[PDB]
Amino acid sequence: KSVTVIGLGPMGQAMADVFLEYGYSVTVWNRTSSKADQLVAKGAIRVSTVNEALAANELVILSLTDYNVMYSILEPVSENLFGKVLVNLSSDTPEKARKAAKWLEDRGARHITGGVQVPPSGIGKSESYTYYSGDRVVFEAHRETLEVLTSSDYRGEDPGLAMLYYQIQMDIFWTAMLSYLHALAIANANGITAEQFLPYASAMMSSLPKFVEFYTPRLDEGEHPGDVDRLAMGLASVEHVVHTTQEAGIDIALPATVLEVFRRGMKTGHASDSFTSLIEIFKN
Amino acid sequence: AVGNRKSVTVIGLGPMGQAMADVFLEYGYSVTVWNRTSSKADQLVAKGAIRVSTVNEALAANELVILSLTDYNVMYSILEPVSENLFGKVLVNLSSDTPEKARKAAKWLEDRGARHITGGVQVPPSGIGKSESYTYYSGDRVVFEAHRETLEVLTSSDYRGEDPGLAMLYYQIQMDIFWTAMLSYLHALAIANANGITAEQFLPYASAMMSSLPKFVEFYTPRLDEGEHPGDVDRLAMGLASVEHVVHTTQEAGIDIALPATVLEVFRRGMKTGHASDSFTSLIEIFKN
Numbered sequence: 001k002s003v004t005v006i007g008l009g010p011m012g013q014a015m016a017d018v019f020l021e022y023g024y025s026v027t028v029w030n031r032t033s034s035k036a037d038q039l040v041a042k043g044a045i046r047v048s049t050v051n052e053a054l055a056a057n058e059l060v061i062l063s064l065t066d067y068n069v070m071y072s073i074l075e076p077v078s079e080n081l082f083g084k085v086l087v088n089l090s091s092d093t094p095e096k097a098r099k100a101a102k103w104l105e106d107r108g109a110r111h112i113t114g115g116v117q118v119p120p121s122g123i124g125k126s127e128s129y130t131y132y133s134g135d136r137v138v139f140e141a142h143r144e145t146l147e148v149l150t151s152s153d154y155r156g157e158d159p160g161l162a163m164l165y166y167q168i169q170m171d172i173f174w175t176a177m178l179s180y181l182h183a184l185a186i187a188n189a190n191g192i193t194a195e196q197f198l199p200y201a202s203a204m205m206s207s208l209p210k211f212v213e214f215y216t217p218r219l220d221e222g223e224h225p226g227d228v229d230r231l232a233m234g235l236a237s238v239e240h241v242v243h244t245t246q247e248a249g250i251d252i253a254l255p256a257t258v259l260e261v262f263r264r265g266m267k268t269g270h271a272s273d274s275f276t277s278l279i280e281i282f283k284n
Numbered sequence: 285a286v287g288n289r290k291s292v293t294v295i296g297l298g299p300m301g302q303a304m305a306d307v308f309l310e311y312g313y314s315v316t317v318w319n320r321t322s323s324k325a326d327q328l329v330a331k332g333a334i335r336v337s338t339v340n341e342a343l344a345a346n347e348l349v350i351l352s353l354t355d356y357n358v359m360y361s362i363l364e365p366v367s368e369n370l371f372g373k374v375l376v377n378l379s380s381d382t383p384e385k386a387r388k389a390a391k392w393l394e395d396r397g398a399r400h401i402t403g404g405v406q407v408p409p410s411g412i413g414k415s416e417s418y419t420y421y422s423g424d425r426v427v428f429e430a431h432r433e434t435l436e437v438l439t440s441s442d443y444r445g446e447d448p449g450l451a452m453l454y455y456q457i458q459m460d461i462f463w464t465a466m467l468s469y470l471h472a473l474a475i476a477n478a479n480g481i482t483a484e485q486f487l488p489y490a491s492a493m494m495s496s497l498p499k500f501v502e503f504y505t506p507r508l509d510e511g512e513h514p515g516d517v518d519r520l521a522m523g524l525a526s527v528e529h530v531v532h533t534t535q536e537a538g539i540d541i542a543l544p545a546t547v548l549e550v551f552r553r554g555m556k557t558g559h560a561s562d563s564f565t566s567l568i569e570i571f572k573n
């Protein structure tokens with residue numbers, strides 16, 4: 001039970017704490033060496049250099065701000081990476097994580113990508129989940145240590161996948177939550193409160209998985225028949241939303257973008273297809 | 285004797301009007317129908333509906349008239365030439381349109397001596413006649429109560445208040461969420477597909493995310509009603525950073541950026557107007573202008 005943590009922001013601090021709680025020997029490094037004071041008081045071993053941190057252990061957790069920090073601190077010590085397993089937790093794009101894995105492999109190290117789904121306070125709780133991706137044999141070799149921090153959800157071999165599943169979920173979260181705020185602004189303009197809207201907003205959100213379930217097999221076939229819905233009629237529905245927004249004096253940017261997507265789909269010949277055919281507009 | 289007359293007129297026989305007329309007939313109503321395209325009533329006539337030739341005749345047949353037309357402009361188009369014959373009628377308009385359109389129609393109808401109930405039907409034709417289905421209703425409460433029994437043959441009802449616009453308000457704000465959130469799903473799936481993963485693989489994650497959203501709505505609702513956006517549990521600056529990673533992921537996958545780029549623009553406007561350290565709920569102020 002021995003692990004190195006490089007990067008002592010809030011996440012790194014939480015992780016290092018939980019490891020110390022469960023009896024691990026924890027070696028730490030940070031560019032600003034004072035950030036480790038509280039951990040050192042709890043038994044963490046602070047080392048002066050990146051070299052010493054890498055030497056201490058096979059498993060190295062990288063809780064850095066972004067992937068550029070990784071290159072900055074490891075590139076000058078590229079000769080010292082053989083046999084190390086670097087678990088990268090920065091939030092970034094799939095391609096960033098892929099480029100990092102390849103760079104590390106070229107220097108004899110192995111990479112596990114992690115997409116942590118909770119804030120620092122979730123660390124050490126089994127109801128918390130982290131996406132992991134990368135070589136399955138490397139991941140299985142360190143799974144026990146990683147699961148001291150959270151439950152795991154291994155997504156596959158591609159180092160980019162842990163970040164893929166994280167970012168596409170955030171695409172839905174932010175866009176759908178903004179739609180909720182937008183809808184509430186219209187509601188407020190017409191005299192209705194968030195308390196009054198609550199059960200209706202909630203019921204709509206909860207209904208969406210049933211649509212996703214319905215359309216999933218069709219989307220996987222590349223099929224957009226107009227048997228239960230037509231794009232033309234979706235467009236007309238969006239248009240009512242845009243006019244409602246305008247009448248209420250609410251900012252039109254968000255529904256106007258939705259309307260523009262529908263129009264582009266109509267303008268490429270999809271009037272009679274399902275609205276799912278708009279995936280072709282996004283695909284590019 | 286208590287109870288509604290078992291007699292009703294339906295004007296507008298698209299798929300929704302056809303479903304409503306069918307349900308009324310099966311329930312035991314005398315159903316009088318009119319449609320611009322008269323042949324669309326053939327099946328209903330075979331089951332006992334009474335087709336009339338003119339809109340005037342359809343209005344004369346009954347007190348209660350259900351409209352299922354494309355929108356409110358259609359209503360004017362057909363009713364204006366028979367404005368004289370609206371006196372004493374109760375028109376229940378189940379057409380999708382904006383709140384203000386419904387308000388203006390309710391006044392126009394009252395000026396002609398008719399009464400108006402706005403309805404926002406929440407289900408497709410197949411949901412008509414099922415009690416798990418709901419329709420939003422609004423308008424004069426006494427008029428609604430007088431015809432509720434008939435309206436409940438079609439769906440359960442959810443009366444929202446006196447303002448005739450409200451039934452279209454609740455309907456349209458739910459559709460703002462539906463279309464925007466479903467397009468976010470398609471956008472996210474396009475990224476997934478570019479990266480080699482399928483809708484089947486995405487399904488449990490898309491569904492879990494969507495199903496988690498009501499918990500956020502519940503958490504924020506009381507704060508929003510106070511006009512409060514403290515940054516105690518989240519800050520806009522950190523949300524912006526999260527949106528930026530979404531935009532870059534999109535671009536790397538070669539996926540159309542219009543939708544996340546508009547999300548990002550909203551966040552940036554909120555940063556511009558001072559809300560870096562407030563909750564992301566502060567973006568409601570950007571929507572408010």
Ligand SMILES: NC(=O)c1ccc[n+]([C@@H]2O[C@H](COP(=O)([O-])OP(=O)(O)OC[C@H]3O[C@@H](n4cnc5c(N)ncnc54)[C@H](OP(=O)(O)O)[C@@H]3O)[C@@H](O)[C@H]2O)c1
Nearest residue numbers: 296297298299300301320321352353354358379380407408
């Ligand atoms: N279908 C759905 O799933 C659904 C769900 C909820 C709410 N709604 C709403 O229900 C309403 C009716 O929709 P729908 O699907 O049943 O059919 P629709 O195709 O909108 O047709 C509705 C009716 O309007 C008539 N109409 C259209 N333009 C007209 C004109 N210029 N003059 C005279 N009549 C006119 C049509 O006559 P013809 O038959 O002669 O074309 C038809 O009777 C809409 O507002 C729709 O948004 C629909």
